[PDB]
């Protein structure tokens, strides 16, 4: 159920079949232009999980705080790191990782062998503004926006970092610290 492939790939061996191009047109010029761009993008990132998150209300430098921690890590390790960081940007990176993995599964890749192979940001459209200063001077007041792109590939070169895991506090009927026998510590 993949989108059609209209040309040969650049891989050493071909894994799919090229299909004939459509012979019908869209009603309006605007629609035709938009759909041609969509067709071009569908020729890319085959056999890999990709995600493109648009118009995140953050800046490039704020996003790079989180992204620099997950590059070249296994998907399982990268996902955990994004959860523990108490930053507003970490929420958007976590959504992108989940969206990309769902994309990989639809293409038929094994989620247990995925590695974060490429991550980068891109500038969006800015909201300009002005703020007054003292003695009649004025300054800038700009709200920034950024795009995020994540690519997941199988059996790519990965870093050896691994995090230790511990259980949380035990609360409820599963806690049995009250059964401790303290009579032993009085002996020699």
């Amino acid at each position: 159920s993949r989108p059609p492939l209209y040309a040969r790939s650049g891989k050493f061996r071909e894994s799919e079949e090229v299909q004939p191009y459509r012979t019908w047109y869209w009603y309006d010029a605007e629609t035709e232009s938009e759909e041609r761009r969509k067709e071009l993008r569908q020729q890319l990132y085959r056999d890999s999980g990709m995600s493109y998150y648009l118009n995140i209300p953050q800046s490039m430098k704020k996003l790079e705080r989180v992204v620099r921690v997950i590059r070249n890590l296994a998907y399982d390790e990268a996902w955990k790191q994004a959860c523990v960081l108490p930053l507003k940007a970490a929420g958007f990176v976590k959504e992108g990782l989940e969206h990309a993995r769902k994309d990989a599964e639809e293409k038929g890749l094994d989620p247990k062998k995925l590695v974060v192979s490429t991550v980068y940001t891109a500038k969006g459209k800015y909201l300009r503004g002005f703020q007054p200063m003292g003695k009649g001077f004025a300054g800038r007041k700009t709200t920034r926006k950024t795009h995020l792109r994540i690519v997941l590939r199988e059996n790519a070169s990965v870093l050896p970092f691994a995090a230790q895991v511990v259980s949380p506090s035990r609360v409820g009927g599963a806690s049995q610290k009250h059964l401790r026998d303290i009579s032993v510590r009085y002996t020699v």
């Binding site: 969509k38 993008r41 995600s51 493109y52 998150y53 648009l54 118009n55 209300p57 969206h99």
Partner: peptide
């Protein structure tokens, strides 16, 4: 806290448009 009633519709449209979303 004192937004105009004559531009309520346009504020709503801007709020919907300016939301993050995934491409295709």
């Amino acid at each position: 806290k004192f937004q105009s009633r004559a531009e309520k519709k346009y504020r709503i449209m801007d709020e919907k448009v300016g939301k993050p979303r995934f491409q295709a």
